[PDB]
Amino acid sequence: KQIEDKIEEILSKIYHIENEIARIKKLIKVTDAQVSRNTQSITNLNTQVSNLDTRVTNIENGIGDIVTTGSTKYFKTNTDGADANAQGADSVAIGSGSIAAAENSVALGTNSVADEANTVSVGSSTQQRRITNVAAGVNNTDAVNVAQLKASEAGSVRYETNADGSVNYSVLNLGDGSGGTTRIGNVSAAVNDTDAVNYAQLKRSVEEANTYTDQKMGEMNSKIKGVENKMKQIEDKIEEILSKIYHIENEIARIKK
Amino acid sequence: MKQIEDKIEEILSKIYHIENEIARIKKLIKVTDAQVSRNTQSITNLNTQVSNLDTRVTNIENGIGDIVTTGSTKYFKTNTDGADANAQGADSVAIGSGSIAAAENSVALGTNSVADEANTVSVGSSTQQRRITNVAAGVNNTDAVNVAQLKASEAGSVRYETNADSVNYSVLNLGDGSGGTTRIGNVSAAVNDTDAVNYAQLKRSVEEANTYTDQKMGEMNSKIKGVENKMKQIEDKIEEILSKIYHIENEIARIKK
Amino acid sequence: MKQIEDKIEEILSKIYHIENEIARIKKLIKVTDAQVSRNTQSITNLNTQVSNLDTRVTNIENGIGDIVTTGSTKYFKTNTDGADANAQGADSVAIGSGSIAAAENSVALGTNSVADEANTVSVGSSTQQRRITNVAAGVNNTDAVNVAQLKASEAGSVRYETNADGSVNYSVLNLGDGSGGTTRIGNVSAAVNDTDAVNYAQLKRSVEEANTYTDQKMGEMNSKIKGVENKMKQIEDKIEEILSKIYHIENEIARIKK
């Protein structure tokens, strides 16, 4: 009676334990299914993160490098200086220490300063720059080069300049510099006392002097002609006197007899 | 009691199988924990990696800010809202908003600058030009020329004055600009009417006038000599007439007696 | 019944140990489940983080576009496939493929431009130069000069002619306006030397000298004519006297006739 019932009790306890263990196995399976999802998720994330690392490293190597250097492959500077400063509206500043303070200006070169509107500065009042390899200008608003200035000034007539920089204006020596002379052509007639005289004008002045001589001359030729005419009158009077005397001498000789 | 011993055997059999399942379950739990331990570590690694990517990405975001939006690096800067630069020509360079380097191997420098001819650098356009400032005097033949250099080519030279119309070619004023005059040396003798004459020619021309005067004096001297020739003849005839009369007067007086 | 009661006690003890094992197992499973929840959550968070990073990186890549590959920003641009610019000199600047700023504080501007002297801006090289265009006329002494300015300056210039070989022809200086007009030369001093230009005052004095010579000479001629006129008047008086004598002789002879 007591034992048979206790055996049944144990048998039911075993039954319930078997069910509990099966329930526990099921829980382990449910957990494992989540761990499987997590393991897979981790795998997906490892891939995505190494893919982003690569993309970030490429961004770093490229555009990162232009930030720190301030240069691209085609716009380069070699400098430790302070940033360029495009201060003015629509200004452009190129090079460390450069400052384009004025509207629509360009400061070009390290430490260049553009402080007037609509200009391109290639330096400053303390450091200027020559501009080199400039081809001869053609259009009116092209820059001119030294060779063009030299060609344009060749043949220019100049005074001598003294050592102190003053010009000696009191003499203008023409000619080749070794004894040669220069003919000055296309000269107008002098009007003021200190104007140069031209050749037509010289010739005209000789002709005036000769005309004055003729005017004086012909006054004396009138006197000389008056003397010439009077002289013929005297000659006729003499011939008449000689004739008279001949007749007197003949008359006296006939009185003699 | 046969049923009781049968049930005891059944109980023991069930217990053996339960004990076996418990051992299997304990192994299963360990398999799961080992994977969970791996996943936990994988997650900690991913947290660290993602945190690092975040910092590398934030640093890049800080660096590229002004470069993408303002188109400017620390040494290449512009202050503008306008249209992109446009390097259209092969090997061209365009710097500044609205700039257009249209032609081959050209450079458009500055906001709205336009380069429309091959192998040129434009500092502006036909709608807006720019002076170039802080240019040091050119030395090489292909260096640019500054205003100082042009002014120095003018200084000390002989130049026509301008009107304001522009150059007045009708007068060339020499001298020092304050009353002083200029002696012009090495001047060749004038050939054409409009050539400047030299002092040698002036002197010769005075000599010609005086020679002309001397010639006319000579003509008058000969007319006079001719008059004095007839005059001496007259003088001799008179002396002879006077003599005749003396002899007549004496002859008449002797007749009187 | 005592052999059986013993086996029953033994069985109850086995069940006790099994119960204790099962309770230990449920505790372990609770512990694992808690860690799995933390992991699941951490993964969800990571998924969002990583997706946000993806978007930020993509937006970076799109912001840049081709700034790296073409070396150009929206405002500093070149169209070229050549070698990198090279700013070699201290404080130098190089702009354009193949450009080389070799010298200190220099600027090489444009494709293949070379700056090889200090403190210069080169717009080309010894083998390829460039004109500089749309330059407004210089005002300041250190402003660049344009072609219009050079031409205006040259137009006011007095110049000898240049031969084809570049020598200057000093033998002729042609003034005038180019067509056929002439130039009056002002502020000229009196000539001293035979090859000096003469001025108008000097011409006028020369005319005076000549006129004076004429007056002196004609005065001397006038004196000579006067001298002849006087001697002619002497002859006239002698004749009048001779005529008078003859009148008296003729009257005297007539009185002798009676």
Ligand SMILES: [Cl-]
């Ligand atoms: Cl997990």
